[PDB]
Design a protein around this motif. Structure first.
Motif, mmCIF file in Angstrom:
data_model
loop_
_atom_site.group_PDB
_atom_site.id
_atom_site.type_symbol
_atom_site.label_atom_id
_atom_site.label_comp_id
_atom_site.label_asym_id
_atom_site.label_seq_id
_atom_site.Cartn_x
_atom_site.Cartn_y
_atom_site.Cartn_z
ATOM 1 N N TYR A 296 16.016 15.512 10.533
ATOM 2 C CA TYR A 296 15.769 17.015 10.673
ATOM 3 C C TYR A 296 14.951 17.587 9.394
ATOM 4 O O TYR A 296 15.012 16.993 8.478
ATOM 5 C CB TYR A 296 17.174 17.691 10.849
ATOM 6 C CG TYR A 296 17.010 19.187 11.370
ATOM 7 C CD1 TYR A 296 17.570 20.126 10.440
ATOM 8 C CD2 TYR A 296 16.219 19.513 12.336
ATOM 9 C CE1 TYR A 296 17.438 21.503 11.011
ATOM 10 C CE2 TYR A 296 16.550 20.703 12.770
ATOM 11 C CZ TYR A 296 16.849 21.883 12.126
ATOM 12 O OH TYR A 296 16.782 23.177 12.498
ATOM 13 N N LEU A 297 14.178 18.554 9.668
ATOM 14 C CA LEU A 297 13.484 19.151 8.560
ATOM 15 C C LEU A 297 14.392 19.869 7.565
ATOM 16 O O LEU A 297 15.296 20.427 8.061
ATOM 17 C CB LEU A 297 12.512 19.946 9.153
ATOM 18 C CG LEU A 297 12.471 21.214 9.466
ATOM 19 C CD1 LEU A 297 11.195 22.034 9.630
ATOM 20 C CD2 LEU A 297 13.154 21.423 10.809
ATOM 21 N N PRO A 298 14.383 19.977 6.328
ATOM 22 C CA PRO A 298 15.050 20.951 5.535
ATOM 23 C C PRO A 298 15.017 22.241 5.690
ATOM 24 O O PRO A 298 13.808 22.748 5.860
ATOM 25 C CB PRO A 298 14.396 20.398 4.053
ATOM 26 C CG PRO A 298 13.866 19.043 4.354
ATOM 27 C CD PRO A 298 13.077 19.216 5.626
ATOM 28 N N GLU A 299 16.086 22.972 5.776
ATOM 29 C CA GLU A 299 16.086 24.198 5.568
ATOM 30 C C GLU A 299 15.657 25.136 4.050
ATOM 31 O O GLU A 299 16.060 26.153 3.998
ATOM 32 C CB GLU A 299 17.139 24.918 6.121
ATOM 33 C CG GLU A 299 17.444 24.510 7.592
ATOM 34 C CD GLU A 299 16.285 25.559 8.408
ATOM 35 O OE1 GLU A 299 15.570 24.670 9.144
ATOM 36 O OE2 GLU A 299 16.252 26.514 8.282
ATOM 37 N N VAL A 300 15.720 23.983 2.990
ATOM 38 C CA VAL A 300 15.478 24.263 1.966
ATOM 39 C C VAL A 300 13.947 24.796 1.520
ATOM 40 O O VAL A 300 13.071 23.719 1.853
ATOM 41 C CB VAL A 300 16.113 23.334 0.816
ATOM 42 C CG1 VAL A 300 15.834 23.677 -0.604
ATOM 43 C CG2 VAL A 300 17.406 23.046 1.106
ATOM 44 N N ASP B 290 24.019 23.919 -2.056
ATOM 45 C CA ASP B 290 24.072 23.152 -0.650
ATOM 46 C C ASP B 290 24.346 21.837 -0.971
ATOM 47 O O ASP B 290 23.490 21.056 -1.751
ATOM 48 C CB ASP B 290 22.457 23.458 -0.132
ATOM 49 C CG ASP B 290 22.554 22.643 1.233
ATOM 50 O OD1 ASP B 290 23.655 22.492 1.798
ATOM 51 O OD2 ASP B 290 21.441 22.469 1.751
ATOM 52 N N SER C 173 22.721 17.299 3.361
ATOM 53 C CA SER C 173 21.346 16.791 3.551
ATOM 54 C C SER C 173 21.300 15.775 4.618
ATOM 55 O O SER C 173 22.531 15.029 5.274
ATOM 56 C CB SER C 173 20.488 16.267 2.247
ATOM 57 O OG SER C 173 19.534 15.683 2.815
#
Lengths: 420, 264
Positions: B65-69, B71, B74
């Motif tokens: 999954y791509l990071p939402e950054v 926290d 991960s």
């Protein structure tokens, strides 16, 4: 990471030679520098990888007025190391002053070796406390190393001078050295001369040639302390990760060591754990209580038995320590080395922080104060005189070691929220 | 098996100890191209003198999954692949659970990274002695012991006792069954099972609190004391919740060893 060793003092250079000889025998290395015919394992910390895979030991020998270095010179193992790292009074202040004037070129050698290394982790020190020439100059170099490199680690292996007397000025010298060791070192490995001497007279029947045996003992201990780095596992394959557990507080950084076989030339791990908790396997001498205990095992181990052994020894309560908090024993495992014949292949080590060495320090604090009070034992040395005309540095070190003993005894109490 | 084990349960040292430290400098806008994440594993292998294998090939580092950054979450997978006649024994369902436990162990390495960071940040402030200094460093030593005991529990169960078996369990269907049993015990002892999920619920609190202690850097000493007290309370509550599940586990018993050795 990559660790450079420094060796100074006569006994320190003895154990450095023995240590490098032991690792050359231990790894697949010839005494010319050549890799052995039958050589998987890491030699990338203390051995530079040279042109013909020559594992050249990353060592700097520091000496002044050489005597034993000549005996190092005529040896088949004088071709393993010495890529020219060798550089040519028994007072602390004498060695301090002599190291003062030649600080630059030896620091240049250190920077040369730092440039030669790709990475760096630490400078491990071979030291002899109150060894005469080693005293003072070793403290000076320790202060210089802490100054120039605030990003690296300092480990000190040293013996503490006690032979039940000899030299009337050595408690002063060892006290100043201890003051420097407390402030200018990151972690200290302490050794006792009389304790190792007593063990040597115990398991064997020697009285004079103790040096030749004690070299073996310290070499085995130090190599055991580094085996999990030298033989790669995956628990604490860095120095810093190992040292982090052992130091509970920056004021207590002295480490007690043992060795499970007093002689190893098929018991289980349960037995030798019980043996190691007996103090006859411990090689360094109210209630004195450990703060934190670690052990490292190398041998033929079954992985279920270590769990049940920890259960049973926990229930038996052979761990006679009362902490002030949550700190407990820690287990670790290492590999038995090849090419070395070992009967009873199970061999262990312990690293524990114990308060009892305070009493030993207190012995010196008593002695020095006694010789200070009568004042017939300073002897008026001139190096001591122009270095300090009032001799208040001895008072300063006395202040520090008093604070140290008070910190010890505050740590003995079941709260360390109060200090000493 | 003893090849894939080195990468997915991290039995190769100074490969994990070189992967993790480099990865955590980033955490993001970085770590999105397959030119640095694909080369940092190659950087980690050369610090351990391991590689030049057909197991080194088919090593694919990838994000699910791509990071939402802070926290404390991960995602990161490491995948190893085989061809047709060995695909039937080692499947795509087993390696998914291998990547599941590998992320867990890597997140455990994040702990000993963050406490090492605070040790270094204190090292640069370490001259003159004061009360705040000693009372501050006890927090670091305190949390260091706790991460060492949870790491030692992992270091014994998934790493020593389950590895003694599956060395003569193999002595065509039987190989698949033995492999699946070994992996099932690995996820069983990892406490990622829903029976031991309330214990895992306590783990996130400790993880978040030590990442909070990393964020704080004597400007605000009392804030750090408050976080320390909440940490001590959660560790105190853990002792009760693991005790309650003895009534309703041989693998958890070792946990009761580590968290309970001297001082209730």
């Amino acid at each position: 990471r990559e660790i450079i060793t420094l060796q100074l003092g006569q006994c320190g250079n003895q154990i450095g030679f023995e240590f490098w000889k032991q690792l050359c025998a231990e790894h697949g290395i010839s005494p010319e520098g050549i890799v052995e015919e039958f050589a998987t394992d890491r030699k990338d910390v203390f051995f530079y990888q040279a042109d013909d895979e020559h594992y050249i030991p990353r060592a700097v020998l520091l000496d002044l007025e050489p005597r034993v270095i000549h005996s190092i010179l005529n040896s088949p193992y004088a071709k393993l190391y010495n890529p020219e790292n060798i550089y040519l009074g028994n007072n602390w202040a004498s060695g301090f002053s002599q190291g003062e004037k030649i600080h630059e070129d030896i620091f240049d050698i250190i920077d040369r070796e730092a440039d030669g290394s790709d990475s760096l982790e630490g400078f491990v020190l071979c030291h002899s406390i109150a060894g005469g020439t080693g005293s003072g100059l070793g403290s000076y170099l320790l202060e210089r190393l802490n100054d120039r490199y605030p990003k690296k680690l300092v480990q000190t292996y040293s013996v503490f001078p006690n032979q039940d007397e000899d030299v009337v000025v050595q408690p002063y010298n060892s006290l100043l050295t201890l003051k420097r060791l407390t402030q200018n070192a990151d972690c200290v490995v302490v050794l006792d001369n009389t304790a190792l001497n007593r063990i040597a007279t115990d398991r064997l029947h020697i009285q004079n040639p103790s040096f030749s045996q004690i070299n073996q003992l310290v070499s085995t201990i130090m190599s055991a302390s580094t085996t999990t780095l030298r033989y790669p596992g995956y628990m604490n394959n860095d120095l810093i990760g190992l040292i982090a557990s052992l130091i509970p507080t920056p004021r207590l950084h002295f480490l007690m060591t043992g060795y499970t076989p007093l002689t190893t030339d098929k018991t289980t791990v349960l037995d030798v754990m019980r043996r190691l908790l007996q103090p006859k396997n411990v090689m360094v001498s109210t209630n004195h209580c450990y703060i934190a205990i670690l052990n490292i095992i190398q041998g033929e181990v079954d992985p279920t038995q270590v769990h049940k052994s920890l259960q049973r020894i926990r229930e038996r309560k052979l761990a006679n320590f009362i902490p002030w908090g949550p700190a407990s024993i820690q287990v670790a495992l290492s590999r038995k080395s090849p090419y070395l014949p070992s009967a009873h292949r199970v061999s262990g080590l312990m690293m524990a922080n114990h308060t009892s060495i305070s009493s030993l320090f207190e012995r010196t604090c008593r002695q020095y104060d006694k010789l200070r009070k009568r004042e017939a034992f300073l002897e008026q040395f001139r190096k001591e005189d122009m270095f300090k005309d009032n001799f208040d540095e001895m008072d300063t070190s006395r202040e520090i070691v008093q604070q140290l003993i008070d910190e010890y005894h505050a740590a003995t109490r079941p709260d360390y929220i109060s200090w000493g | 098996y003893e090849a894939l084990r080195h990468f997915l349960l991290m039995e190769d040292g100074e490969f994990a100890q070189s992967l993790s430290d480099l990865l955590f400098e980033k955490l993001p806008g970085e770590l999105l191209n397959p030119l640095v994440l694909n080369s940092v594993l190659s950087k980690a292998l050369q610090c351990s003198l391991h590689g030049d294998t057909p197991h080194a090939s088919n090593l694919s580092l990838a994000l699910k999954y791509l990071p939402e950054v802070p926290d404390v979450l991960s995602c990161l997978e490491l995948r190893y692949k085989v061809d047709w006649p060995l695909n039937i024994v080692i499947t795509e369902g087993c390696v998914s659970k291998y990547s599941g436990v590998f992320s867990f162990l890597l997140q455990l390495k994040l702990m000993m990274w963050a406490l090492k960071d605070v040790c270094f940040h204190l090292k640069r402030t370490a001259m003159a002695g004061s009360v705040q200094f000693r009372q501050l460093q006890l927090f670091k030593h305190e949390m260091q012991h706790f991460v060492k005991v949870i790491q030692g529990y992992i270091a014994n169960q998934i790493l020593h006792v389950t590895w003694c078996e599956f060395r003569a369990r193999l002595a065509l269907e039987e190989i698949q069954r033995a492999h699946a049993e070994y992996l099932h015990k690995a996820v069983f002892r990892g406490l990622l099972t829903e029976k031991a999920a309330p214990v895992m619920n306590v783990i996130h609190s400790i993880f978040s609190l030590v990442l909070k202690f990393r964020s704080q850097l004597h400007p605000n000493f009392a804030l750090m004391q408050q976080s320390y007290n909440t940490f001590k309370y959660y560790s105190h509550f853990l002792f009760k919740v693991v005790t309650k599940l003895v009534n309703r586990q041989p693998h958890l018993e070792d946990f009761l060893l580590r968290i309970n050795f001297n001082n209730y």
